[PDB]
Structure formats: C-alpha cells, structure tokens
Design a protein around this ligand. Structure first.
Ligand SMILES: Cc1cc2nc3c(=O)[nH]c(=O)nc-3n(C[C@H](O)[C@H](O)[C@H](O)COP(=O)(O)OP(=O)(O)OC[C@H]3O[C@@H](n4cnc5c(N)ncnc54)[C@H](O)[C@@H]3O)c2cc1C
Ligand SMILES: Cc1cc2nc3c(=O)[nH]c(=O)nc-3n(C[C@H](O)[C@H](O)[C@H](O)COP(=O)(O)OP(=O)(O)OC[C@H]3O[C@@H](n4cnc5c(N)ncnc54)[C@H](O)[C@@H]3O)c2cc1C
Ligand SMILES: NCCC[C@H](N)C(=O)O
Ligand SMILES: NCCC[C@H](N)C(=O)O
Ligand SMILES: NCCC[C@H](N)C(=O)O
Ligand SMILES: NCCC[C@H](N)C(=O)O
Lengths: 549, 549
C-alpha cells in the first residue's frame, strides 16, 4: 500500500520528487553566480536552504548566534563516544520524506524510537491518580484505554473524514485532498482540540475521566493535554500525515544532520569547483549572530552582526523563531507589511523541558522474578515527570533515560530550577511509581537538562497554532511568493517550522526552507527546469486557501 | 440602584455581611485559646486568615519564604516618598467588597485607576497595524470599535443571560442567580472564550478583523487575547461581577494592605490582651520558608522550615500557588486525596511582565499645539508593549509610567531579558507610536520590572482556568469542608486566588481565605454565632454545583 507522507494537506507539493528528480532544482543566470545570500540561523531550515542555494551557484552566508543545528541538538555525555541526549527533536516520523532525503544523503543510520506499545519498547507503565498499570501490549491495559482509543478513532472519522483524507494522501490525489481539506479549514480554524474532543459524539457519551485520561496519556501511547488549546487544524495535520507514528531516532544523534549538511560535498554544483561544501565556502564556520537587518541605500539589504560588521546582500533568509525579529534583531519595520508583522508577532510558542541521565547498562530489561515485570518501563504518568523514555544502546553500552519530557504547564513547573533539583524531583516521582527500582544506583556521567522557553535565541520549543491563527500562518507560508509585493518588502524571506503548518515537526522546517529556496532562486532571476517544476510554479494553483476578512 | 458585587455566582455567600456583622465570625472553645495554627504564605490570603483567626483566640504562625504581601507588591523608586510601582495587583474593582473591607479597616485612600476611556484617563491611543487613533471619548474612535462593543454586549446577553444574572447579583437573589448560573456551567466549562466569541451570532457576522481587534484592544478599553484560551466560565465570572470596570488603585501602594493587616490592632480579640496584633504575636516577623509538611506521630501536622526547624500544629493553611506543594514543599502525599492532587497539579498559571519608569512630571498632559493631542496617552497596541499606563501623582510630583503590562506570549517575549533591554524595547515601540514625544528625556530614578513566571515562590502571575477545569476548581474550593474527609486528610487547608473561581482578582484570594477561616474554626470545635452564619454553614445548600463523572 502506498505510504502516508507529509503531503500537504495545505500545500500538497511533492518536495521529495522535486529533490530526487535528476534535473536539480533549477538554475540562476550565470551572471549572478557567486553572489551572496544571507541566511540567518544554522538550524535545519537555514542549512537546507544554504546547501541547495550553493548548488545553484550562489554563495550563501550563514549567520549563527548560538549553536550549530538549532533545535536539532545532540549533547554527548562526559567521557563517552556516541552516547547522546536529544535535547530538541528526537523521533522522526518516516512520513517526513523531505527530511529523510537529507538523512539518506548523509548515509546516517536510524532505528525505531522506543515509543510506548511498539516493538521498540518492551513494556509500558501508566501511573495515574496513584494507580499503576503494566503492559507489554495494548490488550494488557484496563478496558478504559481501548475505549479512549476507539472514541478517538471514531471522533476523527466522524469529524474529519480521516480515512478519505488519508487515502487521498496515499494516492497523492491533489484535487480530492484539497477538496476535503478545504472543507475543514473554515470549520476548525477557530476551534480547539479540546473542543473537538469534548463535542465529539464518541467522547460526549463517555465519562469526564475518559477525556482526562486521553489528555494525560492518550490511549496508552502518549498524552495530548498540552496540545488541547491548539487549533484543531494543527492536530488534524499531525494525525492525517502520521506524524504521530512509525518514528525513528538518528543513531549517534540527529545533530549529525545539520553538521553533515554543513560539511557535505555535492557531486555537482553550478559554478563552484569540486570539493566545495558550505563549510569550505565559509572557511569553516558560519558568521556570528545578527543584530540588525535594514534596507541599504544601494537597494540591497544590510545585515549587521554582533560585532558591528555590516555586509550587503540581494537577499536575506531568516530562519530564527518569529519573535526574534523584534526581540533579538533590529529588523527594519518597512521590510515586512503590517499584516506580516501581525502574523510574526501573534504567533505563540510552546514551552518544553527534558532532563536526561546516563546509566551503566539497560538495567530496565531485567525481570523482577516475583512479578515477571521489567524493572522499569516507558513511563506515562500524571506525576510531574509526565513521560520517561528508555534508550537501549546494546547490552554492552550505557543506556540513556529521558527522566522527564514535559510540555507547557509541566515544563513551566521546572523553569526556574537547576539540573540537580530537576533530576531529584524526577527520581522522587519515579520512586513513587517504582518503589523497588534503584535508578540512582545505575546513574553515571553528568545530568543534562533544557528549557527552550528560557533561551533568548529561541523563545520556546516550537510554535503551537492557536484558534484563529490560520490566516497568520497563511500569510507567513505564502511570504516567499513576492510578485505582488511592494518592492520595499521584496528580497527578505522566512522559513522554519514556525512558518510551516506543522510546527513541532522537522519536516515543516524542511519544506518551508525549500519554498524559500524557490523564492530566492526566482529573486535572482532563476527558474526551475521545465521537467521538475518547483513550489512557486504551482503555488497559486494548489497552495493554501485564503480566508475572508 | 443596588451595586454589582463579587457575589458568587458559584458560591453566592455575603462575605461582606459576614465580616461586618457586629457579632464577629464566631468562636472557638476557650480551652483551645492560644493554640497555634500554621499559615504558609504572607500574601493577602494568609494574612486575612491569620488576622481573623487571631481575633477568634488562636495564635496563627505565618511563614513566608520570600516577601511579605506576595502578589500585592508596591516597589518604591530611588529616593522618593510615596512613589511606587505596582508589581502585582494594581486595579481593584469596587465590586471587591471583601477586599475593600480590609482597605477601609486600615483607613487607606484609593483613587480611580487610569483605565482607557474613563474620567481618570484624559485620552487614549490605539495603535494597530501601524495605524494610530487618538480618542478623548469612545465616539472619537472609528466605527469598527463601536461595532466590536455592540457585538460583545450582544454575545453576552444572547449567550449568557447577562442582564438577568446581573440583576440577580444586584438583588442578591440567590435562588435565581444559582438557577441561571448553574445552567451555564455544563454548557461552558469545556469551551474557550475565543469559541464563545467566534460562534456568537454578533461576531460570526463580522469580519475576522473585528474578532482580532477585540483580542488586541477590545473595544478600546482593553485586550482579551491572552484570556482567549481560558474556559468561558472564567470570563463570565469576570464580566458578570464587574471585575472589569470601576477599578481603584490604593494611594501609596496596595502593599499597604498586607503590611497594615500585619500591624493592625483589633478593638477586640478573644483571649489576647489589648494591643495585640499579628506582628506583636510573632515578635515582628513571620517565620521563614516552609520546606516540608507531614503528619506527625502525635496526630498533628509537622511543618519544617528552611533551616530544619520543625513545629507541630493542629491545623495548617497553605496559600502558596498550587504547584509549590510539589515543587517547593515536600508535602506528604497522603495529606491530600489523589483527586485533590490532580486538581492542584493540573492547574495552569499565566505569565505576566510589567516594566515601570518614573518621570519628572506628568508631561503627557501637555498639549501638542499643532494637533490638540496630549503628548502621550493611555496606549493600547499590537506592538510588544501592549498596554501603557500613565499615573499622575499631581502636577508637582513625579509621574509613573507603566511602559508595558503584558500577559502570556507578550510577557514570554521579555522572559530572559534584563531590565535595561526591556525598557529600551518599550521606548523604541513607543517612539514608533509617538515619534514626536521625548519620553526618555523625562525619565528619572530607577527602572522596575518583573516576570512572575520566573520566581520559584510563584510560578506565574495567577491561575487561568482552562476548558474542563471546573471539576478541579470545585474540588479545591470545597476542600475547607472536611466532614466527609478521611481523617488523614483533615486539618490541612488551602486558600488563595488559585483556589478561587476568579483567579486574577484579589477578591478571590480574600473569599477563599475566609472560607478556610471557617473550616479551621470548625476544626478547632468552634462555630459561628447563630445570628451570623458563615460559609460552611450554608455551603451544602448554595455551594458550587458538582458535575458528573
Ligand atoms: C523539545 C523539542 C522536541 C522536538 N521533537 C521533535 C520530534 O520528535 N520530531 C520532529 O520532527 N521534530 C521535532 N522538533 C522540531 C524540530 O526540531 C524543529 O522543527 C526544527 O529543528 C526547527 O528547525 P528550524 O531550522 O526552523 O529552526 P531552529 O533550529 O530554531 O534554527 C534557527 C537557528 O537560528 C539561530 N538564531 C536565532 N537568532 C539568531 C540571530 N540573531 N542571528 C543568527 N542566528 C540566530 C538559532 O540559534 C538557531 O540555531 C522538536 C523540537 C523541540 C524544541
Ligand atoms: C501581575 C498581576 C496583576 C494583578 N492584577 C490584579 C488587579 O488588577 N486586580 C486584582 O484584583 N487582582 C490582581 N492580581 C491578583 C492579586 O494580586 C492576587 O489575586 C493576590 O495578591 C493573591 O494573593 P494570595 O494570597 O492568593 O497569594 P500570594 O500573594 O501568592 O501569597 C502567597 C505567598 O506564599 C509565599 N510562599 C510561596 N512558597 C512558600 C513556602 N514554601 N513557604 C512559605 N511561604 C511561601 C509567597 O512568597 C507568597 O508571598 C494580580 C496579580 C498579578 C501577578
Ligand atoms: N499522584 C499525586 C501526587 C503528584 C505530585 N504532586 C506530582 O506532580 O508529581
Ligand atoms: N505535541 C507534542 C509535541 C510534538 C513533538 N514533535 C513530539 O513528538 O514530541
Ligand atoms: N506593528 C509593527 C511591528 C511591531 C513589532 N514587531 C513589535 O512587536 O512591536
Ligand atoms: N488576565 C486579565 C485579568 C488580569 C488582571 N486582573 C487585570 O485587570 O490586569
């Protein structure tokens, strides 16, 4: 059967085909070869754009204020080789075909992520209101859990034509997909996920506790409560494109994706000599953080770095999170329309924390000879840790444990606390769940934590779309299409997962980046090859519907 | 006409009458006079309770981990007398009768708060998408604003029987209020404010922009967007009890409320000698922060402070924000039912930042002879400052300007930034609005800022009730009623504005405190006088409806 992929629904362009086609993404007039384009941010969106623009014969100049990779960050533990904690993105749905294009291009290895109740996880434990349930398959759970699942399946089929939309995605039937999706847009933009859940037939006829347990742990594979306030359109996108199943981790860390793109030598670039990579073009490193972007008096865009160094470019791509164009960069107001500012400024970010330790061995696989149970499981709880994940690196390697992965309120619980207290709070919660398991005794190396909200170069883990934000996201996603733009707004571009329709998913950063590549190519008077048309060649036909004032 | 007051709707008890009645709040058996009751937190809820319990003949022992007054905090500027910035609560609706009972008791002076389009504000400026509107009265504003107001009035009357509910409040017609209110509870618990707005007839027939403007500035008297995700029941409570109009500030700072309660000598206490105040009972200061609460082997509650000192009490009231009973205090898990923990733990906190400067004089009242406009106005914008308030202390005193009062996303935009950058960001935004006004030149003293989310003794400005949180709030509000509780859960109490139905409003802290006074009196075998019945005497009859599982 044809795989589900992140194929629209908003802009069902085949990015994977565009990338794989042997003609390449297009071309730029030879007279513009070697011209510079500024790229703000060295995360996945900045680097994907830089890489493909280099291939088209431009000289991207990437600036990075903090760390290479942005929210793809894999921190090594003390003294180890190949043992990392994924601080940002960690579980990549195989529906992410644009992303996986680069993963494959680098020859990186992936393996199934130990999500609860999957073959990669031996066991799961749910702990709610002081009651603990062990499962090695879904059927092992109390009846309430299958009831929640059935009600969710049914609410999605009844309220979104889930099956029909997924079939259309499988077959890449664009006219059908748009018809279905475009029906849903004005009906669900303005409504929350919780409203979708509460007012569904399947859940309205169940107890409040079914809804509540759905929030805390779902049907035993993951909680939803942090996303309850979001526009249901966001959740539809996630489930319809299977963002929420068949996920892999990148072995050795996903940070190897941005780092590898930086160093990767394409077989063929336009203009550049053999052996050219982004790295070599920069002499090893991106430029420092950007402090200012303004229209210069020669018409170009002036980008000023932290040290006052000012350079001029025909085009500038920004990939930082949207608030940073006010908060961290002095970005001249007339460079975006007031409608674009409102979209960039009203956009909301979700908070997230993760706290990891390393352990001497995957001791959780040991059996409690009294009960038959693993000493420790993938843990979902209403306690402060919320989600605990177990990473097995082989019987003879240390294990890693994400003691707590938390979002929104539960992340904000940890905000002001240092790592020692984070870990202690988590161990004390996990001691309530597993009173007989000595986790502490196995812990080695250093403890690693993060709060994405705290960091001024991110002001959050990822966007979450509120009700009524469809029009904002539509403005942002379409910004790379500039033919109708006032001339004073042209030449600056945006990309990244906040521009995307699917914010907490790396595929959205990749796809928007590729749209910007097309926009920038076009800006330099370039164009796609006639046999491999690109995003902006079809955008007016199959792009996101616009809503009324 | 009889005033609107914060009279239910959930528990329409006449706290004001209770407080004012000459008999007093009740009594406790003489044998228990002088016994201690621990109070965690010296904000308004802890201090009200402590004050009323002292009057009944107990010895409250108040602990405070940080600053007296909690979220009633008035910081004096360098070198000045009587010139303060309100860092927490600042505008107290006159419908807050229990609160104003204590304000009057202390003889404190109040004056109308300079909200937009009131007599206390001379002018207001709205700045949206780069367009600026000046108004000295509502009619000065473009027609869109009156439309938004009409639609909101209409959505409230149509969807909530606002007029009826308000009449029932004016008349303190308890059966009618409850009938009207109880109808709304199951219908709106699970739905957001934005949903109520979008799906109203009045707004559904207006452009998206009408909704949007309503979020950003309302109808020209205040924005609603940070409250859009909350349960609509919360909002109903606000508007029905006039929390959102006729607001006063306390002259010299509202922190004079908690500080004067601490020092106030009642005419008559049971047991204590004349001249007794909370201060004199404590020898001048509350005890330090609490680190632990547990059941002791004598059957009392053990409270352990930061320095390891452990003291035992027949009753403990905690008034810190609910998360802190896991995050900051080791509070023995069996002291609360699991249902209670879940309420305490799931409760969500809103973020808030304010940044104030002092100016040499109220220069904003000067006229621009070219335009006839004030040099500066009460400012509502979509720019990052959001709301700017102007505080006139008289022509011959310095003025105070709250450069930016922001909530949620717009507060999170400032989170990691220091005060200098906060003030500069705000002055730059205000320069875009008022390009001809030199604010900087009038600024003297020190700048003052806060972010309530950042402080570990608060983990936010105040609760905001999410959809589906009615049951949690019902559990917490009712926790002072302990006759059916397991014995192990009795004797600990909670109060404060997160226990209340009206979280960002001081009256809710006062009303819950008073309930807990009742509970604690009852716990010590005391009771109200027959001619002045108290909260728990009528709670089972007029209390908040419970919802089904
Ligand atoms: C906690 C968490 C878990 C996640 N889990 C998943 C997952 O399981 N699966 C999945 O697919 N996706 C996941 N994601 C999302 C994925 O990681 C992102 O969508 C993607 O990494 C974002 O890429 P980006 O290039 O848009 O932005 P970023 O990586 O944010 O890149 C922007 C870069 O801009 C830089 N920058 C900022 N300001 C400046 C300045 N003034 N000058 C120069 N540079 C600047 C930043 O430092 C950063 O490096 C997760 C994200 C988080 C936060
Ligand atoms: C930014 C903001 C604006 C507001 N504006 C308004 C307004 O305009 N009008 C209005 O009516 N209301 C307003 N409020 C609400 C009002 O300020 C609150 O409702 C009220 O002050 C809350 O009082 P409380 O006693 O419940 O809690 P708190 O004031 O939080 O007091 C609890 C105390 O417990 C202490 N504590 C915490 N942990 C411990 C520990 N482990 N041991 C000992 N002590 C501890 C804290 O330090 C704190 O002093 C506002 C609040 C804020 C934050
Ligand atoms: N199970 C009830 C206690 C949960 C605890 N307050 C926590 O957040 O972990
Ligand atoms: N809404 C939960 C966050 C989604 C995130 N991409 C994750 O998979 O963890
Ligand atoms: N409306 C003009 C732009 C606003 C600017 N990004 C700000 O946050 O203030
Ligand atoms: N979040 C809106 C209410 C906040 C507060 N009571 C105020 O008037 O500022």
């Amino acid at each position: 059967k044809k795989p589900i992929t992140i194929f629209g629904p908003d802009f069902p362009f085949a990015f994977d085909d565009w990338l794989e086609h042997p003609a390449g993404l297009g071309s730029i007039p030879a007279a513009r070869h070697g011209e510079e384009v500024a790229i703000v941010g060295a995360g996945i969106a900045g680097l994907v754009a830089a890489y493909e623009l280099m291939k088209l014969g431009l000289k991207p100049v990437v600036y990075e204020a903090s760390k290479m990779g942005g929210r793809l960050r894999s921190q090594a533990f003390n003294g180890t080789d190949g043992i990392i904690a994924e601080l940002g993105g960690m579980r990549f749905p195989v529906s992410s075909t644009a992303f996986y294009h680069y993963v494959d291009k680098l020859g990186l290895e992936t393996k199934p992520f130990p999500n609860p109740l999957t073959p990669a996880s031996r066991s799961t434990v749910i702990d709610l209101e002081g009651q603990t349930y062990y499962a090695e398959k879904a059927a092992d759970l109390p009846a309430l859990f299958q009831e929640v699942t059935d009600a969710w399946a049914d609410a999605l089929e009844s309220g979104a034509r889930f099956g029909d939309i997924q079939q259309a995605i499988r077959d890449r039937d664009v006219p059908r997909l748009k018809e279905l999706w475009n029906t849903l847009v004005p009906l669900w933009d303005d409504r929350t996920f919780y409203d979708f859940v509460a007012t569904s037939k399947a859940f309205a006829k169940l107890s409040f506790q079914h809804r509540e347990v759905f929030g805390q742990v779902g049907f035993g594979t993951g909680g939803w409560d942090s996303d309850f306030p979001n526009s249901m359109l966001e959740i539809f996108r996630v489930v319809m494109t299977n963002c929420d199943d068949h996920q892999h981790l990148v072995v050795g860390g996903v940070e190897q994706v941005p780092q590898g793109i930086w160093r990767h030598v394409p077989e063929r670039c336009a203009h550049w000599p053999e052996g050219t990579s982004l790295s070599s073009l920069h002499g090893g490193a991106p430029r420092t953080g950007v402090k200012r972007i303004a229209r210069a008096s020669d018409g170009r865009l002036a980008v000023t770095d932290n040290w006052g160094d000012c350079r001029h470019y025909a085009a500038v791509l920004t990939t930082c999170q949207s608030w940073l164009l006010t908060t961290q960069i002095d970005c001249e107001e007339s460079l975006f329309s007031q409608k674009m500012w409102m979209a960039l400024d009203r956009t909301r970010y979700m908070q997230s924390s993760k706290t990891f330790v390393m352990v001497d061995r995957p001791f959780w696989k040991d059996k409690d000879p009294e009960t038959g149970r693993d000493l420790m499981s993938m843990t979902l709880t209403d306690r402060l840790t919320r989600g605990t994940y177990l990473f097995d690196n082989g019987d003879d390697k240390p294990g890693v444990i994400c003691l707590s992965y938390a979002w929104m309120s539960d992340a904000l619980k940890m905000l002001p606390h240092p790592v020692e207290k984070r870990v202690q709070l988590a161990l004390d919660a996990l001691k309530k769940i597993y009173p007989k398991t000595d986790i502490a005794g196995h812990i080695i190396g250093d403890p690693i934590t993060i709060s994405w909200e705290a960091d001024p170069h991110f002001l959050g883990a990822f966007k979450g779309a509120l009700p009524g934000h469809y029009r904002y996201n539509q403005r942002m996603y379409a910004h790379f299409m500039q033919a109708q733009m006032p001339v004073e707004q042209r030449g600056i571009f945006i990309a990244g997962d906040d521009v995307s329709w699917t914010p907490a998913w790396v595929e959205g950063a990749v796809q928007t980046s590729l749209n910007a590549v097309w926009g920038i190519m076009n800006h330099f008077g370039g164009k796609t090859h006639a046999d491999n048309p690109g995003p902006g060649d079809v955008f007016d036909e199959i792009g996101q519907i616009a809503l009324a004032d």
